[PDB]
Amino acid sequence: QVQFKLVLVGDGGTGKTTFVKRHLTGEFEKKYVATLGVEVHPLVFHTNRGPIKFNVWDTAGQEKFGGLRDGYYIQAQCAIIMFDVTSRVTYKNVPNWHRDLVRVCENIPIVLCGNKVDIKDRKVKAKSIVFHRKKNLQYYDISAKSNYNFEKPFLWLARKLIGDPNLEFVAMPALAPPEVVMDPALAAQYEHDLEVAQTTALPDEDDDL
Amino acid sequence: IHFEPVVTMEEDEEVLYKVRAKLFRFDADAKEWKERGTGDCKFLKNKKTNKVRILMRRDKTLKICANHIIAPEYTLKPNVGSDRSWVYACTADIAEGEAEAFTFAIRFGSKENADKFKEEFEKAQEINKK
Amino acid sequence: GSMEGILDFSNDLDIALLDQVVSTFYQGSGVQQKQAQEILTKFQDNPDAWQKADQILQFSTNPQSKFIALSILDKLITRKWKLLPNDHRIGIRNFVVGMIISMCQDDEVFKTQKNLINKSDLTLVQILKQEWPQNWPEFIPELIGSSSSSVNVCENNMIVLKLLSEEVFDFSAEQMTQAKALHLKNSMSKEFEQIFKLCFQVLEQGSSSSLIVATLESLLRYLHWIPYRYIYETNILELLSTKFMTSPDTRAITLKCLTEVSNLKIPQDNDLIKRQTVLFFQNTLQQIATSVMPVTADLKATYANANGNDQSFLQDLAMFLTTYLARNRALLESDESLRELLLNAHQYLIQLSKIEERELFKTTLDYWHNLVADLFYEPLKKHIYEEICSQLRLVIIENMVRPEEVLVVENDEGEIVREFVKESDTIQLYKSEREVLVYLTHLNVIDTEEIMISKLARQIDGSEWSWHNINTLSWAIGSISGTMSEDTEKRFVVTVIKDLLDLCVKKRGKDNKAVVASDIMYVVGQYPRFLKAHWNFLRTVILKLFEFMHETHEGVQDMACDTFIKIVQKCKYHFVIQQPRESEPFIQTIIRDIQKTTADLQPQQVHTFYKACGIIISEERSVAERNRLLSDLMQLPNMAWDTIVEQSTANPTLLLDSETVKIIANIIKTNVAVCTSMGADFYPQLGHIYYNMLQLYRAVSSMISAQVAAEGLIATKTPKVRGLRTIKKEILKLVETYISKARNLDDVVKVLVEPLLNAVLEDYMNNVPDARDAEVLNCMTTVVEKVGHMIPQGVILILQSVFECTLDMINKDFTEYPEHRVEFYKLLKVINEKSFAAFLELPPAAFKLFVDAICWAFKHNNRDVEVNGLQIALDLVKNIERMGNVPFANEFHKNYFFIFVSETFFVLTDSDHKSGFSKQALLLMKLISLVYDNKISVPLYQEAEVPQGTSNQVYLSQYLANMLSNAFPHLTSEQIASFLSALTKQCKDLVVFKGTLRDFLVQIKEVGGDPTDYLFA
Ligand SMILES: Nc1nc2c(ncn2[C@@H]2O[C@H](COP(=O)(O)OP(=O)(O)NP(=O)(O)O)[C@@H](O)[C@H]2O)c(=O)[nH]1
Ligand SMILES: */C(=C\C(=O)N1CC(F)(F)C1)n1cnc(-c2cc(C(F)(F)F)cc(C(F)(F)F)c2)n1
Ligand SMILES: [Cl-]
Ligand SMILES: [Cl-]
Ligand SMILES: [Cl-]
Ligand SMILES: [Mg+2]
């Protein structure tokens, strides 16, 4: 319906895919599996102006896996440029990504995101991050891991795309859930599945939650 | 003299219990727990039908990460790595859309909260029995 | 599947099928889209795909297909252009040029296919980078000529020239050799006179066109590099600052141009040029006021409305005004006829500073910093800006962000709660706001005080009362501590506190009480100078903080603990002495009631409380009295410890109690906290627990091992085993903390070290990988750092116990055991620095693993590991060189010199370790310089491999040429020879040497790089 093409660009390892997955499923993927060319995922937010759908084109940051490269940007309606605040080279490359992006997409809203602020030893100092000012990009410190500011890039983009500065995310309707009884035939398989689940430790047991 | 003036679906429900929590779902294909959401987990009693459900929404996005009846058949079990979590099988959760079975784990800020959840969970089960 | 047909090059390309695959990818979804993407990538990557590009461009009806065709060509041009036969180069040039001409001459195509034409233009510019001007001398003249034939061609030519300027001046540093960049820059410079003529003519003879906008977009790029005379000796500034400010379509780009004009390199002592710089600013501001908005306009409201391009325009205006004024405001400050202009420009900035947009606020705040720092120093200037500064005081005071210290916040339901997490992204913002407000206070302390005191009065009487208003004001008041004289500050603080206490009595319910309590804590903690002068008040404050330590509001309770230690860090001397009219130093009072004071605190908060007490105790420099205070402070944890030591020594079983495990961990944590603040002074307490603590470490180690044996590796995840390991980790932390601060190193060596090693090393070595604590490695690093020079045999023991077993944990991939990885290399680094002899004693097989371990570290992308690996390598080379001409050094070079050279080259050139370039270059330069300086005393080659007299210099070059020939077979022999000649000649000049490496990294990405590039100087 109301859907917008969003392209996500930035150096390999900056957290693009992890960030999208967090938003898609709620999970935090610890492993680094490099994106091959691009992965497309629809992502819906519920707002006080109705649902907004982003078709997220999560592009490869590794040169060797770049695929169609700027070919992915064609007809994008918005974008996120990612870097990693623990890696100065990734900030240094931001102008390169931005160059390639705006050559294809001349007038779109773009958010610049400095990811991994959860890591204690920050290398790209806050005071250093100024590239967005002359390019009219929005900027946020974010962490896919802690969820710090994780909703901000999508909220800002939605506001710009719908053209409503007072747009807010709203609680989606919660339909009454059904009453189901376990299949007696599957009860023995239930026992096994639960045993494996019980004996697989939960991750990050030192976290606040 | 008259001067003309200038021109969620949780409404029918009582909140029995609310607690801050992190919810996980077990991926059997992989062999790992995956986070589904962090936020307020509510036990909601429908004022018309008297049925009690778990409804949990993610902070900030407010997206539903749990929505299911607290079935009398369910049983909260400990996880090997935690003294502040419960694991249980759910046959019919609709947070993502069509009803689907999951093995859930829910973790709390402390053991005391976890033990309170279980007591409230079991109370809610008795309500759903009536 | 049928879409795969386009990958079969043995058949003719089905263009219709290609258009379907492309459409499926861009317009489709799900599985079909995913399959099409894979097919297209494979198509694109086919090294013969470029040969299909002409056919696609001719017969395709899908613009995305043609874009992809151009991407294929771009890859060919940028990487393999000189591999092509000359006829293919001409052909490609011709069909690219022809396509551009054809798309510009059809109006409907020129209107509707902007993406494809821009891509075509960039593709042309890639050809220019290869061919121009040496093999295309007439390009510029013909482009200039063609511009007159057609408005579409002229506009497009502006796009081509913009892209060319970007590729040559803005983006060449990483992408071209130093020599090629110079060549292209010089070439553009030599013809710019004629380019500018075209640009200026177009700008003269048009108004609001897409042609005008394109021309201005090209000008923006030129301004990065062109001589200022083009701007100042023509009428162009008048056009930019008047005509092009009037139409909104040109206004946006013109403003950006004027911002870059403001950055031109311009003579300093020319009155005429100063006048021109004033004039364009005057013109621009006049246009803003008459065509856009008056100085009085509510820009906060306009920005918030977000119509059209208003947010971008206001951002760009802020950038223009701040850029210009930071450089040129002095031009406006002396002449009375320019005062209104100066102040009006600053009034726009005041209005812009009221906008709700954090990133824009940082930009204007940066400017205000620049201004107020200048006014602080420059004679006779502050009075000019007194009204601006007064308004700015209000803006800043009203937009103070929450300090890191203030731990309460309002949630979505209107409740004042403890924050879930730190607001990490406002740390810098707070510091910046404080900096400006401090300067503003100094500039007029009377105005600042009057504003704050009258605002506070309006909170009290209720007229302006709100949480937002009392908060921002309180934060502002706290933030200016130090600006007033002690005497002035005294009166100010007294008035503020009197008023804050009035509010706290009147504003009720847990939410209000929490807000006001947080604000008083913040203010009071910010004025230690005052507290030190007013003991009765300080004592009262501390007692009140103790009351808050029993608050049911967890935010207030936590903030009281932080505020207590914050005050103690600054005022501790006043707690250790006996104050007039007191019967005892207050530290005695605190210690005596510590159980009651801390009863409702969480353990970590109790530890903070103890740490603060340690700060105070360390003020007592009489040793007997200090040790007595320490003993008194540690009474409760020592009494709990003593009862546990008695029980555990009777029964290892009683330690199987999770309650007991928690108690022990908290005892050790309390010791850690006190040791952190007392440092060297902590020793007597360490001595009280040391031997029993190490026995406890051993007992807990046995329980962990027993549990893993009985339950499997999964036991390490259980609360019980995690709790046991916490005891081990905290013990290690305690010892590390003490040793890192120890002043008596003899005691460390004679008393602490042997039992520590005895307790920890064999236990680490002999546990399974998943039960090994990385904290052992961290503890040993500090031991070696501080006393390694005194314990050579101890260092050897450390290596024996941890080296091979830890290496085996981390040498299968780059990700498992991340903490062990990081601590392992920190340990090796300090051993190599402080006790190199330890490595000399290794058997040859183990020394080989050490070299392997260093090179393995190089290959990490993890910065912590990579950096240490490169440093160890450099330190190792230095260690070897220091030995001189001895057998161990000779054998080291014979065995490992070329391994280090080749491994360093590998990470330099694989494009996957760019973060380490500087240190890789340093290491390579050291290695090469060793041979260049004849510092290696034996032949690096085995005999009969090369003539007997052969110098290591000659052999190094031969080795490297062969290595590079085989690793980079697309390079010519002369490219390799020239690179190596330059590199070796430059091995005493790091900056030049690095340039040569960067040039090599460019050349390896293409074919036919010019070997003379390495002569650049
Ligand atoms: N500490 C921390 N790690 C993160 C964060 N976000 C992502 N990561 C980690 O960074 C690694 C790379 O993440 P990934 O999302 O694959 O990066 P990417 O930008 O998509 N890489 P590519 O361009 O190659 O597809 C993963 O190990 C992931 O767990 C974060 O916010 N904090
Ligand atoms: C207000 C106290 C309150 O609720 N009262 C007084 C009553 F009338 F009895 C009811 N309130 C909040 N915070 C303070 C306060 C804080 C601090 C500290 F610095 F510790 F934060 C110090 C004091 C002091 F007593 F020293 F003034 C007061 N009072
Ligand atoms: Cl296109
Ligand atoms: Cl002091
Ligand atoms: Cl050659
Ligand atoms: Mg990815």
Q: Which chain C residues have a beta carbon less than 8 Å from that of A32?
A: 815
CB C832 within 8 A of CB C875: yes
A50 is in an annotated binding site: no
Interface test with A, best of C323, C717, C1005 (most A CBs within 10 A): C717
- Find the C483 Cα to ligand 1 centroid distance in Å: 45
Which string of b and e fits A66-89 if b means at least 16 CB within 10 Å?
Answer: bbbbbbbbbebbbbbbbbbbbbbb
What 3-state class would DSSP assign to C464? Answer: coil
Which chains are adjacent to chain B, needing at least 3 Cβ pairs under 8 Å? A, C
Residue C156, C-beta contacts closer than 8 angstroms, at least 6 positions apart: C100, C104, C110, C117, C121, C214
DSSP string, C930-949: HHHTT---S-SS-TTSS-TT
Read off φ and ψ for residue C84, nearest 5 degrees: -75, 145
Tokens of C968: 């980079």
Which chains are adjacent to chain C, needing at least 3 Cβ pairs under 8 Å? A, B
Compute the half-sphere exposure of residue A53: CA atoms within 13 Å on the CB side of its CA.
Answer: 7
Residue C104, C-beta contacts closer than 8 angstroms, at least 6 positions apart: C110, C117, C150, C152, C153, C156
A61 is in an annotated binding site: yes
Treating both helix axes as pointing N-terminal to C-terminal, what angle do C310-328 and C271-287 enclose, rounded to 10 degrees? 160
Q: What is the DSSP letter of C4?
A: G
Residue C843 to residue A134: CA distance in whole angstroms: 60
Specify the resolution in Å.
Answer: 1.8
Residue with tokens 């506009």: C155
Treating both helix axes as pointing N-terminal to C-terminal, what angle do C178-204 and C151-165 enclose, rounded to 10 degrees? 150
Q: Which chain B residues have a beta carbon less than 8 Å from that of C718?
A: 80-81
State the smallest CA–CA distance between residue B16 and chain C in angstroms.
Answer: 18
Ligand 2 atom 22: residue of nearest CA: C541
Among the bound ligands, name the one nearest to the CA of residue A12. 1
Atom of ligand 2 nearest to the CA of C504: 1
Mutate which of A25, A30, A32, A85 for ligand 1 pocket (most atoms within 8 A of beta carbon)? A32
CB contact under 8 A, C67 and A71: yes
Q: Is A15 in the pocket of ligand 1 (CB under 6 A)?
A: yes
What 3-state class would DSSP assign to C495? Answer: helix
Q: For domain A1-209, which architecture applies?
A: 3-Layer(aba) Sandwich (3.40)
CB C664 within 8 A of CB C643: no
Cα C56-C57-C60 angle, rounded to 5 deg: 60
Atom of ligand 1 nearest to the CA of A11: 23
Residue C853 to residue C847: CA distance in whole angstroms: 10
Give the method used.
X-ray
Contacts 24+ apart (CB under 8 A), A20-27: A20/A56, A20/A58, A22/A144, A22/A147, A22/A150, A23/A150, A23/A154, A23/B61, A25/B34, A25/B36, A26/B23, A26/B34, A26/B35, A26/B36, A26/B37, A26/B58, A26/B65, A27/B34, A27/B35, A27/B36
CB C437 within 8 A of CB C480: yes
Tokens of C406: 């203030």
What are the domain boundaries of chain A? 1-209
Residue C995 to residue A119: CA distance in whole angstroms: 33
Tokens of C366: 């940066």
Read off φ and ψ for residue C503, nearest 5 degrees: -60, -45
Tokens of C57: 């461009």
Q: Least CB-CB distance to A26: which of B21, B35, B46?
A: B35
Residue with tokens 């030995």: C883
Q: Cβ-count burial of C196 within 10 angstroms (0-12 exposed, 13-18 middle, 19+ buried)?
A: middle
Residue with tokens 């790091």: C990
Radius of gyration of chain C from Cα atoms? 37
Q: Is C517 in the pocket of ligand 2 (CB under 6 A)?
A: yes
H/E stretch holding A42 reads strand A38-47
Q: Is the dihedral of CA B113, B117, B120, B122 positive or negative?
A: negative
Q: Is C504 in the pocket of ligand 2 (CB under 6 A)?
A: yes
- Find the A69 Cα to ligand 4 centroid distance in Å: 61
Tokens of C308: 């059209």
Q: Which residue of C has its CA nearest to B109?
A: C420
**Which residues on chain A place their C-beta less than 8 Å from a C-beta of chain B?**
23, 25-28, 45-46, 147, 150-151, 169-182, 190, 193-194, 196-203, 205, 207-209
State the smallest CA–CA distance between residue B74 and chain C in angstroms.
Answer: 24
Q: Which chain B residues have a beta carbon less than 8 Å from that of A175?
A: 9, 67, 94
Q: Measuring CA to CA, how many Å separate C575 from each of B75, C531, C568, C598, C629?
A: 56, 12, 8, 18, 12
Residue C732 to residue A74: CA distance in whole angstroms: 56
Residue among A24, C566, C590, C134 nearest B34 (CA): A24
Radius of gyration of chain B from Cα atoms? 18
DSSP string, chain B: ---PPP----TTEEEEEEEEEEEEEEETTTTEEEEEEEEEEEEEEETTT--EEEEEE-TTT--EEEEEE--TT---B--TT-SSEEEEEEEEE-SSSS-EEEEEEEEESSHHHHHHHHHHHHHHHHHHH-
Read off φ and ψ for residue B10, nearest 5 degrees: -120, 15
Residue C6 to residue C60: CA distance in whole angstroms: 14
CB contact under 8 A, C119 and A141: no
Residue A31 to residue C518: CA distance in whole angstroms: 41
Before A109, cis peptide (omega within 30)?
no
Q: Chain C, 15-34: which have a CB under 8 Å from a chain A CB?
A: 26, 29, 33-34
Q: Chain B, 79-118: which have a CB under 8 Å from a chain A CB?
A: 79-82, 85, 87, 89, 91-94, 99, 103, 105, 107-109
**Which residues on chain B place their C-beta less than 8 Å from a C-beta of chain C?**
80-83
Q: Is C507 in the pocket of ligand 2 (CB under 6 A)?
A: no
Residue type, C842: L
Q: Is C198 in the pocket of ligand 2 (CB under 6 A)?
A: no
Residue C840 to residue C376: CA distance in whole angstroms: 60
Residue C881 to residue C836: CA distance in whole angstroms: 13
Q: Cβ-count burial of C324 within 10 angstroms (0-12 exposed, 13-18 middle, 19+ buried)?
A: buried
- Find the A76 Cα to ligand 1 centroid distance in Å: 23
Ligand 2 atom 9: residue of nearest CA: C505
CB contact under 8 A, A163 and C306: yes
CB A40 within 8 A of CB A56: yes
A-C C-beta contacts closer than 8 Å: 95
Q: Is C980 in the pocket of ligand 2 (CB under 6 A)?
A: no
Atom of ligand 2 nearest to the CA of C548: 20
| 3-state secondary structure string across C761-810 | HHHHHHCCHHHCCHHHHHHHHHHHHHHHHHCHHHHHHHHHHHHHHHHHHH
Residue type, C45: D
State the smallest CA–CA distance between residue B122 and chain A in angstroms.
Answer: 17
| Helix/strand number for chain C, H first, E second | 52, 2
Give residue A95's Cα distance to chain centre.
20
Domains located in chain B, CATH noted: 1-130 (2.30.29.30)
Q: Least CB-CB distance to A178: which of B9, B23, B92?
A: B92
- Find the C573 Cα to ligand 4 centroid distance in Å: 4
Residue C575 to residue C588: CA distance in whole angstroms: 9
Q: Least CB-CB distance to A136: which of C315, C427, C911?
A: C315
CB contact under 8 A, C914 and A86: no
Compute the half-sphere exposure of residue C274: CA atoms within 13 Å on the CB side of its CA.
Answer: 13
Ligand 2 atom 8: residue of nearest CA: C505
CB contact under 8 A, A134 and C319: yes
Residue type, A114: G
